């Protein structure tokens, strides 16, 4: 149905936007 995060538990709809969420609120290994 939707796409979820891989760090917390916040969803958007599809990868399309979700990608951004991650980079800024989790910032891979930065």
Long-range contact list for 16-20, CB < 8 A, 24+ apart? Answer: none
Residue 8 φ then ψ, to 5°: -115, -115
- Least spacing, CB of residue 20 vs Zn ion, in Å: 11
Binding to Zn ion (CB under 5 A) within 1-30 occurs at 5, 7-8, 10
C-alpha distances in angstroms, 5 versus 1, 16, 25? 14, 12, 11
Provide, rounded to whole angstroms, the least separation between the CB of residue 2 and Zn ion. 13
Closest to Zn ion by CB, 8 or 13: 8
Binding site for Zn ion (CB under 5 A): 5, 7-8, 10
């Amino acid at each position: 149905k939707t796409y979820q995060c891989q760090y917390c538990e916040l969803r958007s709809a599809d990868s399309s936007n979700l990608k951004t969420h991650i980079k800024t609120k989790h910032s891979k290994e930065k």
